[PDB]
Structure of Cyclase subunit of imidazoleglycerol_evolvedcerolphosphate synthase:
Amino acid sequence: MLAKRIIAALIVKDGRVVKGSNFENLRDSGDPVELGKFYSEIGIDELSFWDITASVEKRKTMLELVEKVAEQIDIPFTVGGGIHDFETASELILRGADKVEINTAAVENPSLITQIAQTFGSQAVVVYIAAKRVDGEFMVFTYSGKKNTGILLRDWVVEVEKRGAGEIVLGSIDRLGTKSGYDTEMIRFVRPLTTLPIIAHGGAGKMEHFLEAFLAGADAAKANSVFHFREIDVRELKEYLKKHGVNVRL
């Protein structure tokens, strides 16, 4: 096992952190660049930016975001979504992003994974897999949970690795937003199907959820509002995890 990673996820729109931040020490607590800079200073391992701008502004806003973030931070960052083709992924990586996160366009064109990997390496290619239980099967969902693709999680995972992806963000639509814990059953289901790093996403509410997700086989854990609304202190979380046997970077 490589050291576990703790990832702060920021939802951004029109250059702003959606829903903001409770950090009163910051000049603009809704500024994604200063928010991410703060995170890198207090021990977050990577950032993840997820843009929900509506084009015509999207493309320019996302490039501008990555340009500004890369000015200010030293730690790895990922950008997504609405990433639909190689040209879009490529400009974002070139402008400063370490990795891109793709979901819907990867499901609809799995060779998109391979096109990007062929130029930027597998490590630059994160596949976000959103899944949910449907009649007792884990099914893959696209379009921000709007579409049941009818594809089994089991099959998609294996395919994603085969096409050349470097990491899988495993999102549980069953736990997303709930603060009730990571979907450790989903993680344990995926763990033996792939040699790729698995990032848990969806469900974080307290520090113990992270320990549970790492026991399940996650390589990393991503969270949003528990960090921004300061329900979990990043330093406390890492101390907590190290205390209980987790190999985290301190």
Q: What stands out?
A: The chain has one domain: 1-250. DSSP finds ten helices and eleven strands in the chain. The domain at 1-250 is CATH 3.20.20.70 (TIM Barrel). The longest helix spans residues 58-72.
